[model samples]
Every structure is written in C-alpha cells, then in structure tokens.
Target chain A: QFRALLFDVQGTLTDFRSTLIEHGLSILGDRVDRELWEELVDQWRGCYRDELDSLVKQEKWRSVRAVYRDSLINLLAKFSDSFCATSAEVELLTDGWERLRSWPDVPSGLEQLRSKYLVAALTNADFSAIVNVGRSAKLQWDAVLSAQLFGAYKPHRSTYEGAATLLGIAPSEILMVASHAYNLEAAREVGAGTAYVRRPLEYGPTGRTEDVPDGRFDFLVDSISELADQLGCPRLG
Target chain B: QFRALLFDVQGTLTDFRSTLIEHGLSILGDRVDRELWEELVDQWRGCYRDELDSLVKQEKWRSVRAVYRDSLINLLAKFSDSFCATSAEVELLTDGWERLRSWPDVPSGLEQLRSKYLVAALTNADFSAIVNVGRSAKLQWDAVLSAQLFGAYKPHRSTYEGAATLLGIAPSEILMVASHAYNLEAAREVGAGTAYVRRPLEYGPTGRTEDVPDGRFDFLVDSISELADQLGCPRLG
Candidate 1:
C-alpha cells in the first residue's frame, strides 16, 4: 500500500565501520596507535546526535558536512592536540561518510523494491555525500532527499513532514524505512508509516540496540529483502 | 571532468506526447473526436511555456499539475465547452505527464552514465510527479531536483544555479544534459557544461529540431547511447 519508501543510509543500507576506521587510521598514520584512532572514531560518532540535534533545530542552517566538520575538529582537540590539521586534511577522513560499503542484500533487495515503489535515499547526510556513497557502493535509488532541502536535519518534524510534502503523497502513503528507531519514531509522529530495518552493528563495538524503542512499526523485518516479500514486490526476472 | 549529470525530464529522458494524447482521449471519451483531442493536446503544449513563464516568474508558485490544469482549462474554454470537465477529470489528462514512456535507450544509457557520474533528474515537473515518472518508467537517478525548490523555471538562472548550489560543487563540475536547446542554453548561461540528446520526434506530426540552437553544446550526439560512447562509459556487457 506504500507509494514511496524513504531510507536511512548510515547503518541502514550500509555498514560504516570499516570505512570509518580505515579513514581514521589514514589520518592517524604513523603518529598514533590503533587504539587512539579508534578513540577518535568513537568520539566523533559520540557527537553525531548532539550535532544532529543542533542542526534539526537549525540554529542557523548548518549543513551536515559543516556540522560534521565542526564535530570532528572538536574530537581532535578533545582527544589530542597532535590530532589537529588544516581543513583540507580533516576532509580526508570526513570524506569516509561518502564512501561507505553497502550490505550485500542492499543491491538485490533494492532492485525488488525499486521495481514497485518510489525508492529514495532520504538522509541527514549531505546531498552530494549520499550521491558519492551510492555511486561508490553501487547501490540503486531513484532519488536522494537530503534534509538540506528543508534547511534542517533528521528527527526534526520538518525532516519528515517536508519530505512527505515534497514526495507529494499523503504522509500515510509514505514509508519511512530506517534502522535507527529515533528516525522512524519521528517519521511516525509526522503521520508517515514506519519500517524498522534492524542494523545491530550501527554503533561500533557496541551492538547498539538502544535505538529500537518497540515493535510498533507497521513493517518490521531483519533485512530489506524480507521487506520486499512482505510488501509483495515481484522478483526480478 | 564532470562529477554529476543533471537532466531535463519531460522531453529529455521520457517522451511526453503519446501518453498525453491517449490519456486525454480517454478522459474526453466520446465527448470529442480524435481530431479535437489531438488539437486540444497541441493547444495545451502550445501554452505550456506561457504557464511555465507565469510559474517561473512564480506568478504565485504553482506546481506543474496546477499549471497544466489551468493551461488546459483555458484551452477547454477557448476550444469548446465539450472539452470541459470537473477538476478530477482534468487531472486524468494532467496526470499523463507523470506517466510518460521512456525513450528506448533511456534506462541502459542512464546506467552507463550513472556508472560514472552522479546522475539526477532535474525537472520543471513538480517533485512528486518526477518521482512518479521515474518509478513508473523504472529509470534510476542519484537525486530528483524539482524547479519547485527554487520557485522558478529554466532560463531564470536560479533553476540552473540553484541545482548547482544544492549539488555543493563548482558549476564547472556539473553536466546539464537535455534534448531541448533552450534548457541546455540556459544551463550554459549558468556555467554548466551541456550535452544535447537529439530527439527528432519529441513533438508528433512534425520534427521538433528547431529547439536545438546551432550545435554550441559541449557534446552533440544523436542519442544518449552515443553520448555514453563519447563519455567513455563501458557498454553494458
């Protein structure tokens, strides 16, 4: 019954652990040990929600990249004075967000769903960032709905409502498929249907399960492929 | 080198003529003859640019459907009362724009270009309408950017510049590809590189080549497949 499916990219369609760690190691090369690099990565994510929160409120229209750049700079200062670098060098690691690897099921499952529904990568990520990641990871999506379009960040009412309005469907006709519980919860609040695609590895080394609030989703599945089955999307020929 | 390819949808990626006429005839259903239906379609397209001009100037920010509906209503009145219908009936024909058939080579060529560049459908059609066309046509895109976002239309500078800004890259890094000369010419004015895909039958009963403005495009080709060959994208295996 869904007309469109909105997806959460990070930890939902792809696993970000390896890319983040490898990029972090490159930035910390020869100067710091692996433990220090791990700490830097963890701390960077630690600030994600706070920055996401700050941007959702859109104190002054901060982009995801800007929010991230500022967050990473702080992590460097908080972790070690030696971790500092110019803006250009900082981007080498920050760019990891744009080069994440997709889960194996992402390709086939999306093919199934895309044949039936309007599939879009709806994200709190930068517009170009999702474009780069989708290109590099070789996933399929019909559109990229960046919160930048709404001048805000995820979890804001507008993030869900604005996208619902943009897709030109009743919020009820839109399906917000996400791994992060908070993202879908906000979507539900805005009148859109929600799907929880569980990604237990979303938080590094922690098996971050706290994101799932309950089994209140209209469609709950372990993998997007199963989502296709439940939604009755035809198998590819 | 171009990092992204932006497209003009209605006539560039998908052919809009047959669907418009067939749906129009179906809606008119015995109320008008085939000639009258054909004439109505022609008149609708004739005034398309005028309504577009009104919207581009954003006479008050009307969606493509609204613009088409208003344009079609005037055509109905101007032609004959037989063409008139309730708002719901008018949408059956207006809705044709969202269900146009893709050019035979569209999907494969898009895959070829997309294998390399960040591809997006930049359309004057409303955001939801492009989403509908893309899903139905089963074409792929990195993003769907509507002119509605800028509350303007092509040749307005912002329609081209705004997409460049949202892409978060230098204008030089974007490739504006289309079958319409006015669109690419407008894109050129905003500093985006342009490619002209020759669609000699975009309008029926007569060849529509006059839209092409003297081969000033960076890449000129008879079809999107040829464009793929020139761009060095690998042929589908």
Candidate 2:
C-alpha cells in the first residue's frame, strides 16, 4: 500500500517552460521575437539537462539552481547576438524559476490526496528552489525533499533510495508521481510505485505532448486530480 | 534580516516527555509505579541524548528513531523488574515520538510567523518522525528538514551550516528557535540568529524549570506566541 506520494516539481507540478517564456518576454519585450525567446528557453533547458547528466555520470553534486544559472549564462553566450544582460539581469531571470506557477488541478488535488496520504515532494530542484516554488504557488507539502539531499539527481537510484530511507518506509510503499515518462520509469526501476500524470502543456502549448497507455504505470491520469480519483481520494469542494 | 525560521522539534515544538510518559503508562498500566515510570522515561531520555552525543562526536550517522528504540531497550533492561514488553510494545512506545502532541501556542504562533517568514523544522528527529509529528499535531511547515538530511545531529556545526546551505541562504539570515539553551548557543556559534523559547515543564510539570536573562538570546520568550509577537507578527483572529 502506498503511504507517501513523492512528486517531481518542475514539469509535473509547475510549468517551467511556459513560466520561463513569460518571464523572458517580460524582460526582453519587443526587442526579441517570441519564437526566438521560446527557442532560447528550450535551449537553456537542453544545456541544463546536459550539465545535470554530466554531473550525475561523474558522481558529483551541484544544486539545480546553480545549474540553472550556469545553463542560462551558457545559452546566453551561445546566442550572444540575440541579447545581452547585466549580472543583476541574469539573477532576475534565474530567480524566475522559483516563481513558477502551478497547474490548476494542484490545489484541490493535493488537498484530496493529503487527506489520505503523506504528500511530499521528491524533486530534482534544489531545496530552496522547491521551497520557493511551493510557497509561491501556495502548494502544501508534508515535506520538501530535493535531489541534493541524496547527493544526486532523479533517474539516479540514490535519490529514490535515499527518500525511502529518510522516510522510514519501504520503496514499494511510496508512489512516485511525475509528468515525465522517464521519471516514472526511473522510479519503477527503484522498486517504487509509479504514477504518470500527463502535463500536455508542460513545455508550452506548442510543445510535443506524448500520451501513454493506462497500464504503463501503477496509475496513469491526465491530471493530479485524476490521479487522486484513481487513488480513491474524495473530491474536494 | 531573517528570511527563514528553523525550529528544533522535540521539546521545542512538541511535548515529548509528557507524551512518552503518557504512552508508557498506557502500555504498562498498573503493573508499574507512576514514580518509577517517570524515572524510567527520564532515564531513557538521558540514554538517548548520551547515545546521540556519542555518535555525533564519533562522526557517525544514526536515526533518532533507531536511537530511541535502542535506548528504550537498554533502559527497559535497567528497569526490567518494573515492567516487561514484547517487540511490538517496544515499537508502540517508539512510535510515540512520532505522535507527539504540540504545545498550545504552536498552531497560532507558527501561523502568525509563517505569514511573514518561511517557517520550517530543522530537528534532530529522523525525517519521517518529524513528518508524523507535524501531521499528528496539524503543524504546517514550508519544509521539514531533519538532522539526518545533513548526516549529523544538532549542536554540531554541520547541522546548522547544512540547513543554511540547503536553504540557499546565509547563516545569519536564519533564526534558529529552540527550547534548549544549548541548541540556541550552537546556532549562534554558526552565525545564525537565535531565539530561546522557555518550555519550563518540557520534562513534566514536576520537573525542574529554569528561566534565563532577557539578553541571553536575540529573542527570549516564554512561548512561541511571544516569539511571534517579538518578531512583529500580527495576532491571530
């Protein structure tokens, strides 16, 4: 039986792609094309994933906030002709990740789930980053766990294992909830229960949306609210 | 200025001593004398603290739950004539730590301060233990951080520094609040702001009560409610 629910914050709980694009436009205004700004944000994510992959492979530890800041700078250099910014501007843009807005289903769905289960976050985001994101969106969590706590990021066994160990529960007793298929697969590999919730607009409405079969994970639903329904949580008002 | 408030859970937020004694008497019933039962509980705490201090000094990591179980077994042996219990009974007693009742001022006080600053737990208790305590007490926290997360116990510099590092803030930007003077002293040593909360009967109504001077800490208060007042939080309706 699932005693706790572990969530992936960025794409699952908050739409970082859309959030970054919105903030990007607010900063650049009419100086940059919207399509170019979207591409820039997408490329920054690529740089972040690449940097994170490199660190995990080398068994090194670095906060995701630092990775975000570094990746932003790297992408800026790569697109130097597109725009330029001061140090303060760089920080302002980087801080936007902490202010990401949550999806509509989150508020009521989390309330429903928390009435029955110990709802917590097990995210690749840095500790403070998730804390800020949660506070900004008024999301309630019993605990906020970060990959940095385990000295590695998600898809790494340590993160899942460490969460289980710290929570004083067996891996099988935790339901790892995420919007990313790869994230669910990794949780499944770690002997944890997996729930795949679709975030069709996670990377923006124009981005690719991959839908999966119902039986792929322990639970597959279109939103966290649906996941709560599948888990038998009573609907909230 | 302080951005976050870190708490010490056990005696600071929850009345562990009274709760343990209440559970102890419930388990043992009339077979054990009340005075002897109280002594047993106090001795168990001493054992727990000693074990914790020894492990910290030796640079070892162990959950406070494990320590509680171990110390309870050792103390039961010391008081074997008074009572005897099976493994299940031992587990029930250890689980009492998780079900600790919060002080009267906690709910309102925490809500008040949380309105202005990030409020979280940075306790010596195991990760799940604090989660259970918070949930059972209906305590809301932005984050629940444990000493286990830092791989060290409190009063150690690593615990304070690790909390600051994880929160992505300078040590001076955090206010460490505790009922124990030693915990406040340790936090101050690590450049954190400190508030001394007086829980005169933390051990029990009949136990020793000591009050300190006004300037002993950055803020000295009789309860969490007073701490919120000193921090300029609005009184709850």
Candidate 3:
C-alpha cells in the first residue's frame, strides 16, 4: 500500500484544455482555427518543457508561475499583432491557471483516495498559486508540495525524489500518478511506483493520432475514480 | 506623524512562559529554576500597561509584538507544572511561541518612534499582562495593545474604530511588521501594510517554528537600521 499519492495539478487533475480553448479562442479571434488550437497547446506545453530544461541546465530557479508567464509571453509573441495580451490579459491567463475545472470524476475519486491515504499535488506551481487553485477547485489536499519549494522542475529525478523525502517515506512506498507518460517514466526511474490515467481529451476534442503507449503502468484506468478503486481505495458505489 | 504599527506575537507575540518556557524547561532538565525563570521573565514585561492604556484611551493604535502572545495563553497556568500541555510544549515554550528574542536596540528606546511620534502595541495580550517587564527583561517590545482581532485575537479589530481605523489611515497606509502574525490578517484587513524581517532568534535555541507566514509583503529589512534618519524610511549611517 502506498503511504502517499502525488498528483500533477495541470491536465491530470484539471481540464486544462477547456480553459485554453475558451480563452485562446477569445484572444486569438478568427486568426486561428479552433481545430488547430490543440496543436498550439501541444506546442505551448513543449515550450514549457524546453524552458524548464534550459533553466535546469543553467541551474536557474523560478516559480512555475514565472515560467508560465514567460512561456505565455513567448508563445503570444509568435502571433504578434494577431494576439496582443496586455498586462491585464496576461494576469487573466495566469488566473485561469487556478480556475481550470476538475474532471467530472476528480472530486469523488480524490475523496476516496483521501479516505485511504495522504494525498497531495506535487506540481511545479508556487505554493500560493497552488493553494489558490486548491481553494478555487475545492480540491482538499492533505499536503501541497510544490517544485517552488525545491527550486526545480518536473521530470528532474530530484523533483520526485525530494517530494518523497519530505513526506518521510521511501520512494518505493510513494505512488506518483499522472496522465503524462513522460512524468510517469521519470517517477519510475526515481525508484517510485507509477499509475497512468488516460486523459484522451487532454489535448483537445479531436484527440491525438498517437496511440497510448502500451508500456505497463502499475495499473491503468480510464477515470480517476476507477483508478482509485484499482488501488483498493474504498468507494461509496 | 506616525502611522499605525500593529505588533505583538506571543504573550504579546504568543504566550512565552506557558507555551515556550514551561515546554523548554521540560526539555532542558528538572534542575532549571522554573519559578525564578517565570519571575525573571514575567516581572520584566510588567511595565507596559500605563503606556498601552494611554494609547487605547486616546484612541491610538500602535503595534508591538509582545501583546500578541500574552493574550493567547494564561500566564498563571503557564508556569504551573499542573497544566499538561499537548503540542503546546513544542509550539509554545521552547521554540513555538513565547521564546521570541527581540533585537539589542528594541527596548532602550523606540528607534522607529523616536522620530517624534506616539507608538503603541496593538496586540492580543490581556490588560493586566501588558506591563513592560517582558520587553525590559528580554529586550523585546515597545507598547502593548489588545489582540481583540474581531474581539478574538490581535491582527483583528471588532469595529471600524479598531487599530488601523483609529490610526486614521487605510490599512494599506499602516505598516504591520511581524514574524508570526497570521497571514489572513494581511489579506482580510484594509489599509494594512506588511514588512518581514528575519527573526533568527524568535524561536530561541531550538529550530522548531517551521512555517513562516506567507503572503505579499511590502518591505523586508534585516536590521532596524537607522530609523531617525529615514523619517519615513530615512537614511541611517
């Protein structure tokens, strides 16, 4: 049995794409096709990873909020006059980070998980930003761990390892759950167990052409609640 | 003219004797003179009343750290061995609350207030406990005020006539500098300004106080510097 379960805040716990589609459409106007928005989001996420990797390589530390803003600015710059995000617009985008809606099954699944184990969001977001998102999403976490606390980003081995250490448990005893295969792979590399939940619509409504990786996860489920049950968490129904 | 400066932590800032002293003594050894320890500390803080009462009666609000802790814990039971504390021993006596040690120049004069202004401690301490003994003995505070945050604890005021309002400035205009005062106070209260300076010795010898209050703060200073030269942050040489 796992002593603690760590979740990724964006994509896994929340419907991050819906906000991107809504806000991105509003900001991009008719210049960008709604169907192409997912491609843009995929590229945006790629930029985020690249930025983190570059910073980590340079040993530079910044909060997830800072990284998000920087990446958003870079992405918006590509659109130039077609998408000019004012300071207020940038703030709105950042605030949207906290307002991302939870998947339909998240609350119930998390409730079940909380009944059985200590649950937390181990994200790159700053502590205050994550706390704000928790309050906004009504996701009650036993403890909130942030990369801001460790001054590093995810996929870095220390990010997962350090969280386990702070929770005072062996890495093997802590389960790192995420929708991202890369994140799960990193956790597995760090001597921690992993759970993969398929977020097929995470990219957009059309979904991706690439098939879900067939590699084994400790367990796999379509929904968070199903994942909770697979982990032997007590479910109401 | 002086703006409102809300102070106090245990006893004034937090209950030092009951919370910090008793707990610390327990950890130290049975040989530590418990009575002499209490007397030396308590008597030292017993001098701030007239000053505090004068401020309250005149409808002036000042900030001092002592009043915060004093109001939270009862001094009578604080020293008595009968009061079996739970987590209080760790949080109060030794490094939790009552063990705060102010800077060297804290008591000799109000360097901050020396620039021709009245200063008071807007704290949570009870009336009788507001004497100057603690500051005088430990070199801690300036004036003592009631905690009465919404008539509950300090950093709270029941009516518009509360500390910040009484000072006739927006809470933002008034500066609230503290090491452990709650963060919600800064978020909820109006016209509230905040500054954070590290109090490495605030927890005494043991490094027990872990969670530093997090929020948006206006300024951070390492030392008091020279208050006289910097009228409203004047230069100090």
Candidate 4:
C-alpha cells in the first residue's frame, strides 16, 4: 500500500498553460496582440523544457527560477520587434509561475486524498514558487518538496530516490502521480508505484497531449477525485 | 525582515514529556507504578538527547527512531525488576513520539503566524515521526524539514546551513523559533534570526527548564501567538 502520493505540479495540479497566458496578457496585452501573447506563452514553456532536459542530461544543477527568467528574456528578445518590455516588466512576468492557479478539481481532490494518504508535491519547479502557488490556491500539502532540494530535475532518477529518502519511505511505498508520461515512467524506474492523472487540456483545449495506453500505469483516472476512489478512499458525505 | 520561520519541534511544538507518559501508562501501567513510569519517561528523553548529542559531536548520521528504540531497550533492562515487557510492548512504547500532541496555543498561533511568514518545522526528530504528529494534531506547516535530510542533528552548523540552502533563502532570511536557547544560539551563529519561546511546562510542573537572558534573541515570547504579534501579525477579528 502506498504511504504517500507525490504529485507533479505544473500541468498536473495547476493549469500552467492558461495561467501563463493569463499572466502574459496582463503584463503585455496592452502593447502586444492576444495572438502574439499566446504564441509567446507556448514558446517560453518549450524553452523551459529544453533547458531543463539539457541540465538533467548533463547531471548539472541550476536554479529553476533562473532558468525561467533566462528563457523568458531570450523569448522576449525574439519578439522584440512586435513589443518591448522594461526590465521590471520582465521580472514580473518571470514571477508568473509563482502565481499560477490550480485546476477546479484540485481543491476537492486534494482534500479527499489527504484523508487516506500523505500528499506532497515533488516538482521540478523552484521551492519558493511551489510554496507561493500552493498557499495562493489554498492547497493543503502535508509537505512541499522540489527538485531544488536534490539538485536535479524531474525524469532524473535521483529526484525520485532523493524524495523517498527525505520522506523516510521506500520508493515502493509512494505513488507517483503525474499528467505527463515521462515523469511517471522515470518514477517507475526508481521502483515507485505510478498513478497517471489524465489532463487532456494541459496544453489548452485544442493542443497536443500525450496518450498512454490503457493499463500503462498502476492506476489511471480522469481527476484526483477518481484517483482517491481508486485508491480505496471513499467520498465523505 | 524574515521571510520564513523554521520551528524546532519536540518541546517547542509537541509536548514530548506528557505524550511519552501517556503512552507509557497505556502500555505498561499495569506492570509499573505511575511514579516509575514518569521516571522512565524522563530517562528515555534524556537518553535520546545524549544519543543525538553524541552523533552531532561525531558528525555522523543515524536514524532517530533507531536511537529511540535502542535507548528504550537499555532503560527497560535497567528497570526490569519493576516491570518486564515483551518486544511488541517495547516497539509500541518507542512509537509514542509519533503520537505526540501539540500545546493548546499551537493551532491559533500557527494559523496567525502563517499569515505573515512562511512557517515550517525544522526538527531534530525523525521525519516520519514529525509527519505523523503534525497530521494527528492538524497542525498546518508550509514544509516539514528534519536533521535526517542533512545527515546531522541540531546544534550542528551543517543542519542549519543545509536547511537554508534547500529553502532557497539566505540563512538571515529565516527566523529560527525554539524553546531551547542552545538551538536558537546555534541558528544565530549560522546567520539566522532567532525567536525564543518559553515552554516552561515542557519538563512537567516541577521540572527545570532553560532560561534565556533578556534580549538574548531577536524576539522572546511566552507563546507562538506573542511571536506572531511581535512580527506584526494582528489577531484575526
């Protein structure tokens, strides 16, 4: 039986795409078109993925917040012809990750899951960013963990192994829940149980998302609430 | 000036004395008198401190739970004339730490403190024990940190330094809150701000407690509520 559930933050619990788009429009919508804002959000996210993948491949340690800021600056330069932003504006835009909002099912799902298991975040994001977002969203996590703690990002085996060691639990005793396949697969490689949470609209209503075969994981559910039920946590009346 | 509050557990948050006494009575009350039970409780706690102190002095790592069990068995043998317990009884008595209850002021004080500063437990106890106690007491912590994470116990500079590094904050940005001056003093040496909370009843009604000189810490209070007020967090109306 799983003793705790380790969650993936972005795209899993919080709607990163929409929240980034929301922050983008608020910061640059007055000067840039909405279409351009959307395009920038998508490209900036891809830049972060590429940067993180490189760091993990090289077994290097870098601040996630710094990665976000650098990638945002590079993307801003690429779009400088369309719109220009002040340094302060760029800094505020970089902080958008800290202000990301959780999905609608998160509040109830997390509450019910807490009844049976210790729920914690094991994310690739900066520790401060996840704490701010969790507090802002009123999400109650027994503990907040991050890649920064282990000096490695997700999909790296050390991240999963380190979290389990810190939690004082064996990898087999933890259920790694994520919307992304690569994260769950990496966790499985470390001997952790996997629960795939389907987030079809993670990339927006009409964006590409990974498709996992049925029974790809120990458990698959549409929402965290369903995950709770599947884990034998009955709904509270 | 502080962005976060890292708390010391045991006497500071959970009353280890009374909890151990409670568990002792439950497990061995029939075999031992109340007076002997209290004596065992006190000795068990002192044994743990000595064991931990030795580990820190040697700059070594050991599971806090194992320390508890090993010390308990020794103490039990010393008191064998009064009572004889089976191995199962010894294990239950050792687990008493996990079921510790927080003081009356904890719930209100933590709720208010969290409003203005991030609050987390930076404990010397086993990580699993603190997590169980926090959940049972319904205490809300932004994060739960342990000496095990750094592979060293309290009063070791590395433990304090490692926490600040993992928190992604400067040591000076965290205010170390504890009932023990030794803990606060160590935090101060590491550049972290310190708050002294007077838990006089921690050692029982007639037992001795540590005394801090006036102005020894950045803030001194009789309760966490006072700590919150000193930090300018007004009581919620």
Relative to the real complex, the DockQ score for model 1 comes to 0.77
Pairs with steric clashes in candidate 4? none
Please report, as a residue range, the 10-residue window in candidate 1 chain B with the lowest summed lDDT. B206-215
lDDT of 4 by residue, A6-32 (tens): 999888898878888888788777798
Give the range of the ten consecutive residues with the poorest summed lDDT in model 4 chain A.
Answer: A131-140
lDDT of 1 by residue, A81-151 (tens): 55556678788878888888887778889889976787778888878788788866777776788877887
Q: Pick the candidate with the highest DockQ.
A: 2
Ranking by TM-score: 2, 4, 1, 3
- True-structure RMSD for candidate 1: 2.4
TM-score of chain B of each: 0.92, 0.96, 0.51, 0.97
lDDT of 2 by residue, A51-73 (tens): 88888889888878788898888
Off by over 4 Å in 3: A26-39, A209-215, B1-237
DockQ: which is higher, 3 or 4?
4
Give all TM-scores, in the order shown.
Answer: 0.92, 0.95, 0.52, 0.94
lDDT by residue for model 2 (B40-78), tens: 888888888889889888988887888999998988898
lDDT of 2 at A96: 85
Judging by TM-score, tell me the better candidate of 1 and 2: 2
Docking class of 2: high
